[PDB]
Scaffold this motif. Structure first.
Motif, PDB file in Angstrom:
ATOM      1  N   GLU A  55       0.823  -1.205   0.000  1.00  0.00           N
ATOM      2  CA  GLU A  55       0.000   0.000   0.000  1.00  0.00           C
ATOM      3  C   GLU A  55       0.860   1.260   0.000  1.00  0.00           C
ATOM      4  N   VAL A  56       1.901   1.285   0.837  1.00  0.00           N
ATOM      5  CA  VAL A  56       2.764   2.462   0.929  1.00  0.00           C
ATOM      6  C   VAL A  56       3.433   2.746  -0.406  1.00  0.00           C
ATOM      7  N   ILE A  57       4.060   1.732  -1.002  1.00  0.00           N
ATOM      8  CA  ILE A  57       4.794   2.002  -2.235  1.00  0.00           C
ATOM      9  C   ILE A  57       3.871   2.138  -3.439  1.00  0.00           C
ATOM     10  N   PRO A  87      12.523  11.563   9.727  1.00  0.00           N
ATOM     11  CA  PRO A  87      12.080  12.087  11.020  1.00  0.00           C
ATOM     12  C   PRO A  87      10.710  11.565  11.435  1.00  0.00           C
ATOM     13  N   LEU A  88      10.594  11.032  12.645  1.00  0.00           N
ATOM     14  CA  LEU A  88       9.313  10.630  13.208  1.00  0.00           C
ATOM     15  C   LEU A  88       8.969  11.597  14.331  1.00  0.00           C
ATOM     16  N   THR A  89       7.806  12.235  14.231  1.00  0.00           N
ATOM     17  CA  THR A  89       7.365  13.179  15.246  1.00  0.00           C
ATOM     18  C   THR A  89       5.862  13.056  15.430  1.00  0.00           C
ATOM     19  N   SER A  90       5.410  13.335  16.648  1.00  0.00           N
ATOM     20  CA  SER A  90       3.986  13.381  16.932  1.00  0.00           C
ATOM     21  C   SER A  90       3.340  14.531  16.171  1.00  0.00           C
ATOM     22  N   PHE A 110      19.700   8.964   2.794  1.00  0.00           N
ATOM     23  CA  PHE A 110      18.932  10.197   2.850  1.00  0.00           C
ATOM     24  C   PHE A 110      18.063  10.344   1.609  1.00  0.00           C
ATOM     25  N   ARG A 111      17.022  11.166   1.728  1.00  0.00           N
ATOM     26  CA  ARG A 111      16.170  11.508   0.597  1.00  0.00           C
ATOM     27  C   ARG A 111      15.883  13.000   0.618  1.00  0.00           C
ATOM     28  N   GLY A 112      16.037  13.644  -0.536  1.00  0.00           N
ATOM     29  CA  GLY A 112      15.808  15.063  -0.682  1.00  0.00           C
ATOM     30  C   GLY A 112      16.925  15.718  -1.459  1.00  0.00           C
ATOM     31  N   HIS A 153       3.175  -0.016   9.488  1.00  0.00           N
ATOM     32  CA  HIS A 153       3.477   1.200   8.741  1.00  0.00           C
ATOM     33  C   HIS A 153       4.937   1.598   8.922  1.00  0.00           C
ATOM     34  N   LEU A 154       5.425   1.552  10.163  1.00  0.00           N
ATOM     35  CA  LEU A 154       6.822   1.890  10.422  1.00  0.00           C
ATOM     36  C   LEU A 154       7.765   0.921   9.718  1.00  0.00           C
ATOM     37  N   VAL A 155       7.469  -0.379   9.792  1.00  0.00           N
ATOM     38  CA  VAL A 155       8.337  -1.368   9.156  1.00  0.00           C
ATOM     39  C   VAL A 155       8.323  -1.195   7.640  1.00  0.00           C
ATOM     40  N   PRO A 186      12.262  13.005  -2.653  1.00  0.00           N
ATOM     41  CA  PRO A 186      11.811  12.790  -1.278  1.00  0.00           C
ATOM     42  C   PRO A 186      10.505  12.017  -1.249  1.00  0.00           C
ATOM     43  N   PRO A 187      10.123  11.471  -0.094  1.00  0.00           N
ATOM     44  CA  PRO A 187       8.823  10.801   0.003  1.00  0.00           C
ATOM     45  C   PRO A 187       7.684  11.784  -0.208  1.00  0.00           C
ATOM     46  N   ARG A 188       6.569  11.267  -0.722  1.00  0.00           N
ATOM     47  CA  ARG A 188       5.391  12.097  -0.929  1.00  0.00           C
ATOM     48  C   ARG A 188       4.900  12.654   0.401  1.00  0.00           C
ATOM     49  N   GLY A 189       4.618  13.954   0.423  1.00  0.00           N
ATOM     50  CA  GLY A 189       4.253  14.615   1.657  1.00  0.00           C
ATOM     51  C   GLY A 189       5.416  14.968   2.553  1.00  0.00           C
ATOM     52  N   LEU A 190       6.645  14.903   2.047  1.00  0.00           N
ATOM     53  CA  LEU A 190       7.827  15.216   2.832  1.00  0.00           C
ATOM     54  C   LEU A 190       8.794  16.042   2.001  1.00  0.00           C
ATOM     55  N   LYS A 191       9.584  16.860   2.693  1.00  0.00           N
ATOM     56  CA  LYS A 191      10.685  17.583   2.077  1.00  0.00           C
ATOM     57  C   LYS A 191      12.028  16.913   2.328  1.00  0.00           C
ATOM     58  N   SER A 196       3.871  18.328  17.988  1.00  0.00           N
ATOM     59  CA  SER A 196       5.167  18.992  17.904  1.00  0.00           C
ATOM     60  C   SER A 196       5.761  18.940  16.505  1.00  0.00           C
ATOM     61  N   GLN A 197       4.943  18.658  15.495  1.00  0.00           N
ATOM     62  CA  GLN A 197       5.388  18.424  14.130  1.00  0.00           C
ATOM     63  C   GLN A 197       5.322  19.695  13.291  1.00  0.00           C
ATOM     64  N   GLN A 198       4.917  20.806  13.904  1.00  0.00           N
ATOM     65  CA  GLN A 198       4.936  22.116  13.271  1.00  0.00           C
ATOM     66  C   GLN A 198       6.028  23.018  13.831  1.00  0.00           C
TER      67      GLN A 198
HETATM   68  C1  LIG Z   1       1.902  17.890   4.841  1.00  0.00           C
HETATM   69  C2  LIG Z   1       2.830  16.832   5.349  1.00  0.00           C
HETATM   70  O1  LIG Z   1       3.995  16.986   5.614  1.00  0.00           O
HETATM   71  O2  LIG Z   1       2.193  15.664   5.484  1.00  0.00           O
HETATM   72  C3  LIG Z   1       2.699  14.684   6.372  1.00  0.00           C
HETATM   73  C4  LIG Z   1       3.065  15.199   7.791  1.00  0.00           C
HETATM   74  O3  LIG Z   1       2.361  16.101   8.180  1.00  0.00           O
HETATM   75  C5  LIG Z   1       4.199  14.730   8.736  1.00  0.00           C
HETATM   76  C6  LIG Z   1       4.182  15.631   9.973  1.00  0.00           C
HETATM   77  C7  LIG Z   1       4.150  13.121   8.909  1.00  0.00           C
HETATM   78  C8  LIG Z   1       2.804  12.431   9.362  1.00  0.00           C
HETATM   79  O4  LIG Z   1       3.141  11.242  10.076  1.00  0.00           O
HETATM   80  C9  LIG Z   1       2.624  10.908  11.259  1.00  0.00           C
HETATM   81  O5  LIG Z   1       2.085  11.671  12.018  1.00  0.00           O
HETATM   82  C10 LIG Z   1       2.812   9.457  11.502  1.00  0.00           C
HETATM   83  C11 LIG Z   1       1.719   8.695  11.911  1.00  0.00           C
HETATM   84  C12 LIG Z   1       1.867   7.337  12.142  1.00  0.00           C
HETATM   85  C13 LIG Z   1       3.104   6.729  11.965  1.00  0.00           C
HETATM   86  C14 LIG Z   1       4.196   7.484  11.557  1.00  0.00           C
HETATM   87  C15 LIG Z   1       4.052   8.844  11.325  1.00  0.00           C
HETATM   88  C16 LIG Z   1       1.857  11.843   8.239  1.00  0.00           C
HETATM   89  O6  LIG Z   1       0.979  10.940   8.877  1.00  0.00           O
HETATM   90  C17 LIG Z   1       2.716  11.068   7.206  1.00  0.00           C
HETATM   91  C18 LIG Z   1       2.504  11.280   5.701  1.00  0.00           C
HETATM   92  O7  LIG Z   1       3.788  11.080   5.083  1.00  0.00           O
HETATM   93  C19 LIG Z   1       3.847  10.311   4.001  1.00  0.00           C
HETATM   94  O8  LIG Z   1       2.920  10.069   3.278  1.00  0.00           O
HETATM   95  C20 LIG Z   1       5.242   9.746   3.774  1.00  0.00           C
HETATM   96  O9  LIG Z   1       5.667   9.999   2.477  1.00  0.00           O
HETATM   97  C21 LIG Z   1       5.133   8.223   3.938  1.00  0.00           C
HETATM   98  N1  LIG Z   1       3.863   7.810   3.390  1.00  0.00           N
HETATM   99  C22 LIG Z   1       3.042   7.005   4.093  1.00  0.00           C
HETATM  100  O10 LIG Z   1       3.342   6.598   5.203  1.00  0.00           O
HETATM  101  C23 LIG Z   1       1.747   6.627   3.464  1.00  0.00           C
HETATM  102  C24 LIG Z   1       0.996   5.539   3.903  1.00  0.00           C
HETATM  103  C25 LIG Z   1      -0.207   5.227   3.287  1.00  0.00           C
HETATM  104  C26 LIG Z   1      -0.666   6.001   2.233  1.00  0.00           C
HETATM  105  C27 LIG Z   1       0.080   7.088   1.795  1.00  0.00           C
HETATM  106  C28 LIG Z   1       1.281   7.401   2.406  1.00  0.00           C
HETATM  107  C29 LIG Z   1       6.341   7.513   3.371  1.00  0.00           C
HETATM  108  C30 LIG Z   1       7.595   7.808   3.894  1.00  0.00           C
HETATM  109  C31 LIG Z   1       8.731   7.181   3.406  1.00  0.00           C
HETATM  110  C32 LIG Z   1       8.623   6.246   2.387  1.00  0.00           C
HETATM  111  C33 LIG Z   1       7.375   5.947   1.863  1.00  0.00           C
HETATM  112  C34 LIG Z   1       6.240   6.580   2.352  1.00  0.00           C
HETATM  113  C35 LIG Z   1       1.915  12.634   5.398  1.00  0.00           C
HETATM  114  C36 LIG Z   1       1.453  12.840   3.985  1.00  0.00           C
HETATM  115  C37 LIG Z   1       1.753  13.487   6.428  1.00  0.00           C
HETATM  116  C38 LIG Z   1       0.936  12.934   7.619  1.00  0.00           C
HETATM  117  C39 LIG Z   1      -0.403  12.330   7.106  1.00  0.00           C
HETATM  118  C40 LIG Z   1       0.328  13.821   8.722  1.00  0.00           C
HETATM  119  C41 LIG Z   1       5.387  12.576   9.679  1.00  0.00           C
HETATM  120  O11 LIG Z   1       5.582  11.241   9.215  1.00  0.00           O
HETATM  121  C42 LIG Z   1       6.084  10.893   8.026  1.00  0.00           C
HETATM  122  C43 LIG Z   1       6.032   9.407   7.851  1.00  0.00           C
HETATM  123  O12 LIG Z   1       6.515  11.661   7.208  1.00  0.00           O
HETATM  124  C44 LIG Z   1       5.451  12.819  11.193  1.00  0.00           C
HETATM  125  O13 LIG Z   1       6.720  13.476  11.071  1.00  0.00           O
HETATM  126  C45 LIG Z   1       6.701  13.386   9.627  1.00  0.00           C
HETATM  127  C46 LIG Z   1       6.760  14.731   8.941  1.00  0.00           C
HETATM  128  C47 LIG Z   1       5.576  15.107   8.065  1.00  0.00           C
HETATM  129  O14 LIG Z   1       5.658  16.459   7.681  1.00  0.00           O
END
Ligand SMILES: CC(=O)O[C@H]1C(=O)[C@@]2(C)[C@H]([C@H](OC(=O)c3ccccc3)[C@]3(O)C[C@H](OC(=O)[C@H](O)[C@@H](NC(=O)c4ccccc4)c4ccccc4)C(C)=C1C3(C)C)[C@]1(OC(C)=O)CO[C@@H]1C[C@@H]2O
Ligand SMILES: Nc1nc2c(ncn2[C@@H]2O[C@H](COP(=O)(O)OP(=O)(O)OP(=O)(O)O)[C@@H](O)[C@H]2O)c(=O)[nH]1
Ligand SMILES: Nc1nc2c(ncn2[C@@H]2O[C@H](COP(=O)(O)OP(=O)(O)O)[C@@H](O)[C@H]2O)c(=O)[nH]1
Ligand SMILES: [Mg+2]
Lengths: 427, 253, 207, 431, 29
Positions: free
Chosen positions: A22-24, A272-275, A317-319, A227-229, A357-362, A278-280
């Motif tokens: 699902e992730v990839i 980076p993993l953050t709650s 690294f990615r970015g 998801h983490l794995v 970089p990953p989608r939704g990440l810088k 504190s993610q802003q």
């Molecule tokens: C606007 C924005 O930045 O969106 C982010 C986000 O807000 C943040 C805070 C995310 C958010 O992550 C979490 O809060 C989180 C929740 C449960 C487990 C782990 C994390 C996010 O969920 C994580 C998610 O990130 C991804 O999609 C990654 O690319 C990740 N994708 C997935 O996990 C995924 C799963 C199912 C469907 C689609 C995507 C990924 C990372 C590496 C390799 C492959 C994929 C997104 C968009 C966000 C949220 C939603 C808030 C953060 O996480 C990640 C994984 O990037 C928390 O710290 C980071 C920094 C991000 O900025």
């Protein structure tokens, strides 16, 4: 190109692989129907690493879904992304292993292991240039550990040239869900040592602690851990799918880290993993990512890296980052903690940088550390095993199932020998 | 327990190099294992060279044992089953990489190998020599006179053991002949007949010697009985004469 | 691993066990061979090596050990030296016998790390050799009977010689306590003659 | 009629060559698709339709970076046959590059390089770009240099390598490959100009006033240096030195052929506007120890020979005055048996400016290439980082299992045990 | 052990559900 065959056994492996796919698939812009919908030409430039093409411009994953009980398989079939797989790849038994290494390995598994060997052989002949195999399982279960070891052995005696990359959920002492975990874990480590080129050790307790403290989740279910794995898995091989200044594939990573043939048990981690709260506030920078790399709390294995010297480290690294920044970060990390890194290997850290970089990440980053301290994670098991084996507890099951008595002693001896191997280079 | 042998010593290390090279050269290693050997090569070992040397050096111990893949595990198993006492100071990964600093021990390990070989030969021929004794010494036991029942019983036991050994040898020869898809017991039958004839001749000689000894003993017994009767009569006469002379002397003095 | 083709066929375990029990052995039970272990297998090597050619292990081990086990030198590693010598010479004599019966793949791991297949092949070779030896003994029992008759005759001759010696050693006297002979009789005669001369002189004086 | 062939081994070389070809295409006025809206004869050969194809060969054991080249802004500049790729990268393995994986692509690369050399009429040398620290850049470069020295034993061969840094190296097995490639960078080469990543990082931080240098800036600066070296064959000037006289000026002994590079003025925009560049100060900055490209201090060594390539409008009398000033200075110490140590060439075409670049327009510039003993201090550093691994036979099993013999490690080290003395015995005075 | 092999064989004579040996060429030569 470089194509990887993905295999997973047991309920744990099936669920982790489902989340990974699902992730990839979301990363590559693939809907559950298989039709591409992304807005980037770089997603399909190398999509063949994970997805095999088929008419109608559809893409099917190179997944070999195997289990001895159709329960979790029929759960993943009806899931959100369950149709994506090839229906022929769904291979299944009827009588579960019942948490027996012998049943999953010797008798019940053997009747089915040919029906997966032929499938994986067909998949490997369907690609262009095989890079290796990707296996997800757990050492504490019956079908997982046993069938994974059986498949590992069969592939190694069938594909000696390629690389063998596996993700194993090693049992944890505190979080326990099975009374015969030590036996299966000890029996599985025997095959994992001699029939695998690199293995990433994962504990459920470490993932639970990461979810408790880093992500500050309330009730972390199995979805979050998988998801983490999955994120770790994707981070490991992000170099194959996308361009970058420095590119490191599986063989490159292995020759960087692995110093000796029997020392390939790596602790993985992500940043980076953050709650979400504190993610802003915090801003993403390379020194912060490198600091979070070596945090003793971010590890995905329930053992403290501070208890033994690191052997080698890999950082992917990615970015878009200046490489002076990352290289200086590694130099600072090494020299500031010079007692945590062995002395007879200068420059323990190997760095790779991926441009996309990953989608939704810088910015993102993955850490893979081969450290001596992992020997702790073994002695505990070799205690519990012994603590049962001396009283011959629960042996009758395995022994009547078809396991010779001397095999347990051999497995315990080899576990002790590997512990001595890791401890030998610590001092 | 610790290692008492001074492997870290220098002149000792050179001496070990010396006799190891001498032994390795005197067995035509360079030809049979088609690998040249030099003092410099043993100074700086390599994986392939050390493995080949260990393989050749162990095959002198158990020629019937064959090697296979997974060389390191096989070496560790060999070291374990050789009843090696100092194994707790060795590790599998060190075996995998011989040439490191740990080599300062490993070469000395080979030394003990060679020493066993030397010891082996002092055993080896003697085993055949043991059979050689059964070929000759027991025959001498059959050619010696007997003076006690225990000696006769020992001679009979030795003759029975020799007969059993001859029968076993004939059976082994017949089995060897029958192994090669044939039935040719004629040489075995001839050997058995020759052994039986030799045993019969030895038994006849022993019986003749025993009969001669018995006849001599009977003649000596008759002569001893006659001499004992004569000696008893003479002793009685001498005692009576001495008593009479003493009485006469006492009366006259 | 060494492996050769065998003239004898592969034989299954159960009648192997019963025939090994029937012929000479008693430790060759079903579970003993069904569970390969070092101690039992090496002991079985011992009973067979004392079986087919009939000389004990301990005699050979001591007669090959005495030169290193004695006090030629004081070095401490003598005991491990001799133990390695023991295990190697057991390997070596077993190898002699097994190449004498057509097995040229046997080794030391067979002694100390046995497994079912090679052990049962060795037992099939053992049973074929035992049957052939039994046939040879049945054919050549005439020689055994002749040897037994010769041994009985020798025992009778030895008993007769012992009886003759005992009869000879039954003569003793005050003069001649070492069995009567000519010297003791001559000494007694000389003493009697001297005493008689003295008595005659005394009688003539007192006449 | 001069020509020059450039060879680019995968990771470092391909990117450095991409920067170099950006610079050359800008220099000669050619558009980035090859159409031009003489000087270009050394690098670019023309066709009927006016298209100019470069004399470049791009090689790698993985196709990703070439695919970036194959799809970037220069996908139409190259003829699609010089872009050579493998299937799996060498993966930091010297044996994989040299023995196992390289030999399946070595035939194709030799065939293409021979095809390119056929069109050349007076080919002068090979500009080989590689890196000492990786698997491809060591093994495949060694194999290719062996083949070239066998097939082209007369023509010169110039290697523009990327030596591993003392501290910021990015590979666990880097010392192994770097030591292994010495035997093939020693005898089968002519003038290998060493480059360290750390030194250019420091130069970018100090002179260029940027603290986020990507690989692009280093590649651009190396392209500037190589263009300054090759400018003598493309444009006229007061003094022009080709590769043969260049070697006859620099290299005094057959084994002492490891020059040390420097460029000037590496200046930013505002500093350029405020400063007034003079020949004396750029010549002195060429001798500035922190301006060197290898992390070694020239004060600890004696300069063997020096050559200065003054790009842009410079008068020879000013050059002679700068040479006299340098000789008077006692910080720059030469060797006794080399009285005349400075060889000078001047080209009339000032350096170009790449749009979006970091180097401002300077009416003049100067490239320094100095053969000196200070470079010896670099070798010993790796001689440490090698030993601490080989003292335990750490990663040897990853090479022996690929086709390598273990002894070849020590032999390679033995070569350094000789080469150091070749920078030491000649360092002693005649008496 | 005083149990003579020849004496024991003579006493036994005066295949134990088996056959008088065998000899067959192995197929996997
Ligand atoms: C606007 C924005 O930045 O969106 C982010 C986000 O807000 C943040 C805070 C995310 C958010 O992550 C979490 O809060 C989180 C929740 C449960 C487990 C782990 C994390 C996010 O969920 C994580 C998610 O990130 C991804 O999609 C990654 O690319 C990740 N994708 C997935 O996990 C995924 C799963 C199912 C469907 C689609 C995507 C990924 C990372 C590496 C390799 C492959 C994929 C997104 C968009 C966000 C949220 C939603 C808030 C953060 O996480 C990640 C994984 O990037 C928390 O710290 C980071 C920094 C991000 O900025
Ligand atoms: N100056 C400079 N050096 C680079 C560049 N790219 C890579 N490198 C060097 O390459 C070294 C790492 O080697 P690798 O990543 O293994 O690349 P390689 O040398 O071609 O070896 P392979 O990966 O097997 O192909 C680093 O130490 C860098 O110094 C670049 O763009 N500029
Ligand atoms: N990380 C992780 N671990 C799991 C998951 N599901 C189960 N486990 C653990 O894996 C161990 C083995 O359980 P199971 O999968 O049923 O074993 P199997 O029958 O061999 O497949 C259990 O102790 C669980 O704690 C999961 O989704 N993620
Ligand atoms: Mg590469």
């Amino acid at each position: 190109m470089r194509e990887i065959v993905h295999i997973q056994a047991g309920q744990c492996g099936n669920q982790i692989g489902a989340k990974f796919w699902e992730v990839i698939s979301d990363e590559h812009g693939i809907d559950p129907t298989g039709s591409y919908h992304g807005d980037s030409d770089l997603q399909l430039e190398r999509i063949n690493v994970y997805y095999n093409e088929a008419a109608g411009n559809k893409y099917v994953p190179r997944a070999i879904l195997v289990d001895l009980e159709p329960g979790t398989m029929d759960s993943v079939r009806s899931g959100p992304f369950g149709q994506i797989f090839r229906p022929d790849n769904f291979v299944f038994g009827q009588s579960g292993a019942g948490n027996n290494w012998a049943k999953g390995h010797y008798t019940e598994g053997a009747e089915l292991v040919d029906s997966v060997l032929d499938v994986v052989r067909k998949e490997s002949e369907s690609c262009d240039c095989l890079q290796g195999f990707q296996l997800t399982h757990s050492l504490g279960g019956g079908t997982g550990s046993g069938m994974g070891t059986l498949l590992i052995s069969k592939i190694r005696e069938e594909y000696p040239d390629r690389i063998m990359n596996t993700f194993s959920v090693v049992p944890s002492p505190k979080v326990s869900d099975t009374v015969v975990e030590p036996y299966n874990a000890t029996l599985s480590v025997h095959q994992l040592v001699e029939n695998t080129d690199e293995t990433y050790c994962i504990d459920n307790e470490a993932l639970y602690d990461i979810c408790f403290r880093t992500l500050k989740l309330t009730t972390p279910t199995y979805g979050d851990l998988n998801h983490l794995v999955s994120a770790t898995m994707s981070g490991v091989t992000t170099c194959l799918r996308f361009p970058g200044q420095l590119n490191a594939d599986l063989r490159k990573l292995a020759v960087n880290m692995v110093p000796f043939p029997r020392l390939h048990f790596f602790m993985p981690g992500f940043a980076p993993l953050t709650s979400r709260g504190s993610q802003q506030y915090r801003a993403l920078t390379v020194p912060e990512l490198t600091q979070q790399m070596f945090d003793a709390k971010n590890m995905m294995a329930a053992c403290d890296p501070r208890h033994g010297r690191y052997l080698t480290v890999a950082a992917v690294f990615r970015g878009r980052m200046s490489m002076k920044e990352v290289d200086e970060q590694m130099l600072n990390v090494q020299n500031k903690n010079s007692s945590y890194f062995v002395e007879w290997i200068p420059n323990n850290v190997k760095t790779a940088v991926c441009d996309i970089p990953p989608r939704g990440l810088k910015m993102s980053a993955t850490f893979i550390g081969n450290s001596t301290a992992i020997q702790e994670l073994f002695k505990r098991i070799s205690e519990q095993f012994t603590a049962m084996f001396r009283r011959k507890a629960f042996l009758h099951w395995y022994t009547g199932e078809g396991m010779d008595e001397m095999e347990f002693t051999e497995a315990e001896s080899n576990m002790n020998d590997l512990v001595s191997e890791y401890q030998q280079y610590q001092d | 327990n610790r290692d008492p042998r001074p492997l870290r010593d220098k002149n000792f290390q050179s001496a070990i190099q010396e006799e190891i090279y001498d032994y390795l050269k005197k067995n035509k290693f360079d030809i049979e294992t088609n690998h040249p050997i030099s003092i410099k090569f043993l100074k700086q070992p390599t994986q392939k060279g050390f493995i080949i040397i260990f393989k050749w050096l162990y095959l002198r111990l158990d020629p019937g044992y064959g090697f296979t893949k997974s060389i390191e595990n096989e070496i560790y198993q060999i070291l374990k089953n050789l009843r090696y006492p100092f194994l707790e100071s060795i590790n599998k990964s060190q075996i995998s990489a011989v040439g490191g600093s740990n080599w300062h021990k490993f070469l000395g390990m080979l030394h003990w190998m060679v020493r066993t070989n030397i010891k082996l030969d002092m055993c080896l021929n003697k085993v055949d020599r043991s059979l050689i004794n059964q070929n000759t010494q027991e025959i001498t036991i059959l050619s010696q006179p007997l003076k006690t029942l225990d000696e006769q019983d020992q001679r009979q036991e030795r003759y029975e053991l020799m007969v059993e050994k001859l029968l076993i040898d004939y059976f082994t020869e017949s089995y060897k002949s029958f192994l090669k898809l044939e039935d040719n017991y004629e040489p075995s039958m001839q050997e058995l007949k020759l052994g039986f004839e030799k045993f019969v001749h030895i038994i006849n000689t022993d019986i003749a010697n025993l009969q001669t000894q018995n006849d001599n003993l009977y003649e000596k017994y008759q002569e001893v009985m006659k001499i004992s009767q004569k000696i008893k009569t003479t002793r009685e006469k001498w005692k009576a004469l001495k008593s009479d002379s003493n009485k006469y002397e006492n009366y006259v003095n | 691993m060494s492996r050769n083709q065998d003239v004898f066929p592969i034989l299954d375990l159960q009648e192997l066990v019963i025939c090994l029990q029937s012929c000479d052995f008693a430790l060759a039970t079903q579970e003993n061979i069904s569970r390969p272990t070092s101690d039992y297998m090496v002991t079985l090597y011992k009973q067979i090596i004392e079986n087919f050619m009939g000389i004990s292990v301990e005699s050979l081990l001591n007669s090959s050990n005495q030169e290193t086990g004695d006090g030629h030198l004081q070095e401490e590693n003598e005991n491990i030296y001799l133990d390695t010598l023991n295990v190697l010479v057991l390997n070596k004599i077993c190898f002699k016998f097994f190449e004498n019966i057509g097995v040229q793949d046997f080794n030391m791991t067979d002694l100390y790390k046995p497994e079912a297949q090679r052990t049962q092949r060795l037992l099939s070779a053992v049973v074929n050799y035992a049957r052939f030896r039994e046939e040879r003994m049945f054919d050549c029992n005439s020689f055994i009977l002749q040897m037994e008759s010769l041994l009985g005759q020798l025992r009778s001759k030895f008993d007769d010689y012992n009886l003759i010696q005992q009869q000879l050693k039954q003569y003793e006297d005050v003069d001649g306590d070492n069995i009567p002979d000519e010297q003791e009789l001559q000494k007694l005669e000389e003493q009697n003659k001297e005493l008689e001369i003295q008595l005659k002189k005394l009688t003539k004086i007192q006449e | 009629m001069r020509e020059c062939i450039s060879i680019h081994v995968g990771q470092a070389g391909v990117q450095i060559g991409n920067a170099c070809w950006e610079l050359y295409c800008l220099e000669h006025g050619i558009q980035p698709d090859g159409q031009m809206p003489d000087s270009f004869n050394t690098f670019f050969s023309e066709t009927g339709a006016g298209k100019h194809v470069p004399r470049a060969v791009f090689v790698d054991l993985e196709p990703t970076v070439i695919d970036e080249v194959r799809t970037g802004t220069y996908r139409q500049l190259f003829h699609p046959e010089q872009l050579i790729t493998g299937k799996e990268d060498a993966a930091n393995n010297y044996a994989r590059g040299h023995y196992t994986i390289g030999k399946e692509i070595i035939d194709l690369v030799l065939d293409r390089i021979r095809k390119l050399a056929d069109q050349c009429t007076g080919l002068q040398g090979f500009s080989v770009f590689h890196s000492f620290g990786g698997g491809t850049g060591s093994g495949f470069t060694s194999l290719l240099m062996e083949r070239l020295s066998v097939d082209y034993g007369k023509k010169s061969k110039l290697e523009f390598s990327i030596y591993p840094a003392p501290q910021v190296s990015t590979a666990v097995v880097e010392p192994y490959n770097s030591i292994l490639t010495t035997h093939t960078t020693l005898e089968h080469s002519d003038c290998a100009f060493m480059v360290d990543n750390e030194a250019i990082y420091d130069i970018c931080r100090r002179n260029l006033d940027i603290e986020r240098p990507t690989y692009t800036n280093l590649n651009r600066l190396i392209g500037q240096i190589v263009s300054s070296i090759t400018a003598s064959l493309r444009f006229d000037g007061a003094l022009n030195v080709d590769l043969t006289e260049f070697q006859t000026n620099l290299v005094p002994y057959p084994r002492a052929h490891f020059p040390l590079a420097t460029y000037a003025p590496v200046i930013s925009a505002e500093k350029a506007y405020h400063e007034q560049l003079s020949v004396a100060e750029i010549t002195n900055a060429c001798f500035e120890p922190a301006n060197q490209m290898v992390k070694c201090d020239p004060r600890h060594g004696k300069y063997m020979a020096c050559c200065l390539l003054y790009r842009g409008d410079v008068v020879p009398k000013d050059v002679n005055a700068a040479i006299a000033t340098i000789k008077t200075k006692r910080t720059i110490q030469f060797v006794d048996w080399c009285p005349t140590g400075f060889k000078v060439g001047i080209n009339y075409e000032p350096p170009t400016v790449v749009p979006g670049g970091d180097l401002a327009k300077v009416q003049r510039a100067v490239c320094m290439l100095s053969n000196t003993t200070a470079i010896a201090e670099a070798w010993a550093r790796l001689d440490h980082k090698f030993d601490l691994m080989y003292a335990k036979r750490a990663f040897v099993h990853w090479y022996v299992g690929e086709g390598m013999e273990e002894g070849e490690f020590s032999e390679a080290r033995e070569d350094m045990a000789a080469l150091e003395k070749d920078y030491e015995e000649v360092g002693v005075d005649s008496v | 052990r005083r149990k003579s092999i020849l004496h024991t064989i003579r006493n036994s004579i005066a295949i134990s559900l088996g056959s008088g040996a065998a000899r067959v060429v192995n197929g996997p030569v």
